[PDB]
């Protein structure tokens, strides 16, 4: 509710970017330095649109956890002029569920949008259009196409990235701090 909403708003300007790839429109969380995270499904190429600018991509590396499981997110590094404000400290050391979370969407079509998704609960194994992953979490909210990459936040942590849904529920890849270690 209110507390996750205001924390979510504090991330928006400095860290939550509108992007476009050949696959469509996505929300992108910048984490630190020139490092950001996107859904694998966005399939970033050699350039990517960020806000109004076509930006060269330094690399895109699929995020695979310490158990060898693809998390369906890719870590992208960018030929941006400025570094992102470092939000490492807001990514929890442990994958975290949360009550009354906020999902932040920021795309050209859904700009600066805060979605009260309610409680985010453990889900675990998830088969997303035939691609299996784990460590996912679920919220009973009817998320939509165009919300992938959306940032799931608690009172003061960034807990997940929206990756899929079935029309009545939504699912995020869980985040923990070690995923972003250099």
Ligand X SMILES: CCOC(=O)CC[C@H](C[C@@H]1CCNC1=O)NC(=O)[C@@H](CC(=O)[C@@H](NC(=O)c1cc(C)on1)C(C)C)Cc1ccc(F)cc1
Q: Does 160 bind ligand X (CB under 6 A)?
A: no
Work out the number of other CB atoms within 10 angstroms of the CB of residue 12. 16
**Phi first, then psi: what are they for 27, rounded to 5°?**
-95, 140
Nearer to ligand X (CB atom), residue 160 or residue 170: 170
Distance from C-alpha of 40 to C-alpha of 134, rounded to nearest angstrom:
14
15 DSSP 8-state letter: H
Among this protein's residues, is 162 annotated catalytic? Answer: no
Q: Is 160 within 8 Å of 120 (Cβ atoms)? A: yes
**Annotated active-site residue in 51, 62, 148, 162:** 148
Contact track, ligand X, 18-57, x by CB under 6 A: -----xx----------------x----------------
**In the complex, least distance from residue 104 CB atom to ligand X, rounded to whole angstroms:** 14
- Among 142, 141, 140, 143, CA closest to 163: 143
Q: Does 135 bind ligand X (CB under 6 A)?
A: no
Among this protein's residues, is 72 annotated catalytic? Answer: yes
Can you give the binding site for ligand X, defined by CB under 6 A? 23-24, 41, 72, 126, 128-129, 131, 143-148, 163-166, 170
């Amino acid at each position: 509710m209110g507390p996750s909403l205001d924390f979510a708003l504090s991330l928006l300007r400095r860290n939550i970017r509108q992007v476009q790839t050949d696959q469509g429109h996505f929300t992108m969380l910048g984490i630190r330095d020139r490092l950001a995270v996107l859904p694998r499904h966005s399939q970033p190429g050699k350039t990517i649109w960020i806000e109004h600018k076509l930006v060269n991509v330094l690399d895109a590396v699929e995020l695979v956890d310490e158990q060898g499981v693809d998390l369906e997110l890719t870590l992208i590094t960018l030929d941006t002029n400025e570094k992102f404000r470092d939000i490492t400290k807001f990514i929890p050391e442990n994958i975290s569920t949360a009550s009354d979370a906020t999902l932040v969407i920021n795309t050209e079509h859904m700009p600066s949008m805060f979605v009260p998704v309610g409680d985010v609960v453990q889900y675990g194994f998830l088969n997303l259009s035939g691609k299996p992953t784990h460590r996912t979490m679920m919220y009973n909210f009817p998320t939509k196409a165009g919300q992938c990459g959306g940032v799931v936040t608690s009172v003061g942590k960034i807990i997940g990235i929206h990756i899929g849904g079935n029309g009545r529920q939504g699912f995020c890849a869980g985040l923990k701090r070690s995923y972003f270690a250099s």
